Write a protein that binds this ligand. Structure first.
Ligand code: MET
Ligand code: MET
Ligand code: MET
Ligand code: MET
Lengths: 75, 75, 75, 75, 75, 75, 75, 75
């Protein structure tokens, strides 16, 4: 499987709204609101790299509340 | 007790109105518009880390004029 | 001749449409959506540095979906 | 006098519009479009620090086309 | 309790032997070698901020292999 | 009066002793050891910008335990 | 197939000789010495992500002249 | 001709003796010690990019005092 950590910036007053969307997703294993330039860090897992590609470009990046993301694929 | 400094980037031209809004908050002890990568520096004091957590999420991150923050907790 | 790579951050969910627009440009030889702080990596080739200058100002910086770039010129 | 360099990010397709505003200002000594995360770097001079404070918060930061700025005051 | 994610850059080729050391530390809940600007990411859990800062300056910053860290405290 | 905040990085284990030297300077109004990127945040005040330049370049920067400083002048 | 771009920082004066070693690897499709933050930009391809992990951690990162790498996997 | 601005961080307390050296270099058109993340900013002018990269790796990166540079080529 593929494990990845996604750092996210959400629109103001929407970080909780996004967390609630994420915590209902099978791929999300853990999610936290964090201090700093990023609002959240999310740990996700997919069977294949191709599924991760789809998840992030279709589910995450298309979420109206998300303004930016930086994903760190784990070895 | 918790003392922390929050450096923040605000929308160009909104730094002063944002500062006035923050200065009105009890948790805020000092606030200055500054030159550099950051536009505002705010000093806050809260009873607990949890209160600091909530100041960041329920107050700072709900203000659309604030774009990026960096929090440094006194230790 | 000039060869350069432009790494760019785009609005969440716009990376692919931006890429298709760039791929249509003659100066663009390759373009990939990538994981990490950047969302797109583009390889361009122009006759002169001045042409590279104009590609950045008249094309890249006029596209509202592109937010931040970093250009590395081959040497 | 006070000398400072201002790094600026402008709205897409407005960097030239901003340059034209800047090149008509007495305080601007030189201005350039630059590669990178910033669109322009501008060298300004004011008689006093107080005048710089006014110039940047009133003229620069209030310019509708400007999204962010980072000023480096010179010694 | 204090939960935090620490992003680290390590001496090239030393990332794994460093991770082993980290996974040995009780404060470390999970550790991964990652792709991107950072090479490692660990999720730490301490009882107090004091213990967290103490953990970094004693076990993290003391490891020669580790060249740079960025800490995001979870809320 | 010129007010400024200095973010300082000091040689490890010297944070406390450096702060005590700073607290002894009449230019220093506040000094805090903090957690994170920077080791210290210091609030200073001088009558003129000329004095601030001299104070930082001749005193602060000459302190052997201080490695980096990022001064943010206030409006 | 997995395609990725590696941004590399090498010990000064070793950029050219490192590139020639890279160009000799069948995983490497393109390599360029560039101006700026990074010294080299390298395009690589492998059949699986597992192979990429192995290639970067066992070959790339073990090269003595390579100091830092930031790999950006493509979608 | 190629015009570029180089931002540098220097060993604390060495910024001025370093600047003197820079002002001695013919490629250097102006140099200032600045407040902020960077300590120095120089405006360089060379005939070719080749000469610019050569200027940094020969005169800039070779100075021990200089710890970090960021280059913005002017368009
Ligand atoms: C892979 S879609 C755009 C990628 C983005 N930079 C991220 O890592 O989230
Ligand atoms: C001094 S108004 C806001 C300051 C901003 N960070 C700048 O240096 O341009
Ligand atoms: C995979 S070992 C360290 C990886 C490094 N951060 C890179 O992305 O190149
Ligand atoms: C004024 S000497 C170097 C100044 C440093 N960049 C600072 O802002 O603290």
């Amino acid at each position: 499987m593929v494990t990845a950590f996604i750092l996210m910036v959400t629109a103001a007053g929407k970080e909780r709204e996004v967390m609630e969307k994420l915590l209902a997703m099978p791929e999300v294993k853990e999610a936290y609101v964090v201090y700093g330039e990023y609002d959240l860090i999310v740990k996700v897992e997919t069977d294949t790299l191709k599924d991760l590609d789809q998840f992030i470009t279709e589910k995450i990046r298309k979420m109206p509340e998300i303004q930016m993301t930086s994903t760190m694929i784990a070895i």
